[PDB]
């Protein structure tokens, strides 16, 4: 009784695809972000925004297609279809890069939608909402990289473009201009990601190799029952093994699994903080002591100064085509180059 | 090199000389460690989410598990019940053995491919090269993001080991 | 002298590096894939100049 | 004065000490280069 309660009833039915209140936000926005990416990478160019072909229609492959960012001249325009730039024209809207903000924004709200889904399903099933909490790290990364970072720069143009090779370009740009590998926040990020993979691997392997024999099959997968009360592998034997191999070992299963949440989630959050810094070009670019010494002493060389040379190469050789709005013309004679190459 | 910045040097020169980012084995490697991190967090959070209540609010939930206890410490049916609704019922693992095997296999295989990526680019079978792959009706090159990547790689190439090359091709 | 061109690269803390810039530097390009144990060097000084530590490690 | 009923004892077990010290020391090992710059 009461349309609100009837609606709630319907939204929360246990169907094949749970909808929920959260679904009202999630499904349209996720569908539009995915659909936008497929439409753009299949049919849409980047000629007028980047001087790039970017679709299957133009001859790109899966690795090279992208939905590219708008031209730098658009600033941080929302670039709404009915906005002052496209003025309701769908074709021009595509040509001006409207699909990029379409996808970034519908995607952001879709991520909000999904995390809300995690909360709603957790609440309905009666478990603690740690999955949502963990999803905060993907959120932080998306928001810092696709929204905050370009908002700090001149325009959406320098946001990552939605494509495989485009993303690779984003990586190389961050090396060349930001010296991003030197940034301790990126490093913590890397430690969290690789450490996460390490934990995934080692935990999986450990459980699979300390299994109790709970059946006669040589394929041991059948010897498990979801409702069984007993642990399917030996924590005691696992603990002894790792204690003797590595010196230390988990002894608490609850702590083990919390730690598996903590490591990659914390890593991604730290990387997000670094990117927020880079939005402002607030880089970990140099070590001043290094530079003072090297400037005064032409025989002093480290891997740090070598990498700066590489960066200078990247900037000079990539900027004219990567930043066409600057109209860079770098005569041959000013290009930095080592001997012969 | 056995050092942090030296490691980055190695990576950048590697990219110049092999276009490793466009190599499918390095891509599988990335899928392996991104995926590994994802599934790490996912598993951690699900098991954590389904811990059976054994403690009060003023103590750590971890005291709810005792080392060597025979009973499983979380509700795998609840965990699965959440996960299947989050996606659809069948993407989920209800079988802990299959699930843990997946957790082992995804990063291990992905990283195997990363290793093989480095190990075969060792013999200069390099990443995909789509430099100037798109051409218009007249014959003008239409750049793709692959060509921008090429501009960056060129920067790395011409600057690295700036005093070491006397001849125009870097053949090792 | 990592690249074998008498252009020695400093890797250690005492010689001007911090934790991020420091390294044990790969053996010389003049050595190539030749086995370079300590006893192949005329001296520890030679050994160090050519990146012997890297190979040993 | 009446004793406050909201008080609670605090704990840090040895393993948490080792984890925490590892975290601090490794963070310092990481950030110190940037502190000296």
């Amino acid at each position: 009784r009461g349309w609100f309660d009837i609606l709630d009833d319907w939204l929360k039915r246990d169907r094949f695809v749970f909808v929920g209140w959260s679904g009202i936000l999630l499904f349209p926005c996720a569908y539009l972000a995915l659909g936008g990416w497929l439409t753009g990478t299949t049919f849409v160019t980047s000629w007028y925004t980047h001087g790039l072909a970017s679709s299957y229609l133009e001859g790109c492959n899966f690795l090279t297609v992208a939905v590219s960012t708008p031209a730098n001249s658009m600033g941080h325009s929302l670039l709404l279809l009915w906005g002052p730039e496209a003025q309701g024209d769908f074709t021009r809207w595509c040509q001006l890069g409207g699909l990029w903000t379409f996808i970034a924004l519908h995607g952001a709200f879709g991520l909000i939608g999904f995390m809300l889904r995690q909360f709603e399903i957790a609440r309905l099933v009666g478990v603690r909402p740690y999955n949502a909490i963990a999803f905060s790290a993907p959120i932080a990364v998306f928001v810092s990289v696709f929204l905050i970072y370009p908002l700090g720069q001149s325009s959406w143009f320098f946001a990552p473009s939605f494509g495989v090779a485009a993303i690779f370009r984003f990586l190389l740009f961050f090396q060349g201009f930001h010296n991003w590998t030197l940034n301790p926040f990126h490093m913590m990020g890397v430690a969290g990601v690789l450490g996460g993979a390490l934990l995934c691997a080692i935990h999986g392997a450990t459980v699979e190799n300390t299994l109790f024999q709970d059946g006669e099959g040589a394929s041991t997968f059948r010897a498990f029952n979801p409702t069984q009360a007993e642990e399917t592998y030996s924590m005691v034997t696992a603990n002894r093994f790792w204690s003797q191999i590595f010196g230390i070992a988990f002894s608490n299963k609850r702590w083990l699994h919390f730690f598996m949440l903590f490591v990659p989630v914390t890593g991604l959050w730290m990387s997000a903080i670094g990117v927020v810094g880079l939005a402002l070009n607030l880089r970990s670019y140099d070590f001043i002591s290094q530079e003072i010494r090297a400037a005064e002493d032409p025989e002093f060389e480290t891997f740090y100064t070598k990498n700066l040379l590489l960066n200078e190469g990247i900037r000079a050789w990539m900027a004219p085509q990567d930043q066409p709005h600057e109209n860079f013309v770098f005569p041959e004679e000013v290009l930095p180059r080592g001997n012969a190459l | 090199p056995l050092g942090i910045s030296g490691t980055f040097n190695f990576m950048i020169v590697f990219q110049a000389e092999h276009n490793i980012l466009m190599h499918p084995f390095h891509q599988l490697g990335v899928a392996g460690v991104f995926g590994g991190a994802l599934f790490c967090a996912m598993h951690g959070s699900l098991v954590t989410s389904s811990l059976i209540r054994e403690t009060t609010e003023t103590e750590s939930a971890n005291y709810g598990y005792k080392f060597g206890q025979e009973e499983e410490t979380y509700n795998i049916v609840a965990a699965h019940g959440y996960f299947g609704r989050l996606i659809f019922q069948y993407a989920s693992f209800n079988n802990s053995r299959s699930l843990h095997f997946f957790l082992a296999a995804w990063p291990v295989v992905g990283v195997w491919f990363a290793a093989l990526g480095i190990s075969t680019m060792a013999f200069n079978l390099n990443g995909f090269n789509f430099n100037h792959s798109v051409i218009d009706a007249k014959g003008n090159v239409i750049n793709t993001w692959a060509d921008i990547i090429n501009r960056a790689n060129l920067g790395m190439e011409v600057m690295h080991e700036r005093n070491a090359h006397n001849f125009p091709l870097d053949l090792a | 002298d990592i690249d074998g061109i008498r252009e020695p690269v400093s890797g250690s803390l005492l010689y001007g590096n911090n934790i991020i810039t420091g390294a044990v530097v790969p053996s010389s390009n003049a050595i190539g894939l030749h086995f370079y144990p300590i006893w192949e060097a005329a001296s520890l000084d030679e050994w160090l100049y050519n990146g012997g530590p890297y190979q040993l490690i | 004065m009446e004793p406050n009923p909201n008080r609670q004892p605090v704990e840090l077990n040895r393993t948490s000490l080792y984890l925490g010290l590892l975290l601090i020391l490794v963070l310092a090992l990481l950030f110190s280069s940037y502190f000296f710059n």
Binding site: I248 | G68 | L13 | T15, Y18, L29, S32, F36
Partner: peptide, 30 residues
């Protein structure tokens, strides 16, 4: 003093490895 600092922190970490391994709280079965 920079070098001394780096080496000091590293040394403390190794010491910690020693204690965390040989002077851990022993796991006990219930």
């Amino acid at each position: 003093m920079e070098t001394i600092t780096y080496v000091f922190i590293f040394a403390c970490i190794i010491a910690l490895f020693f204690f965390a391994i040989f002077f851990r709280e022993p796991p006990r079965i219930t």
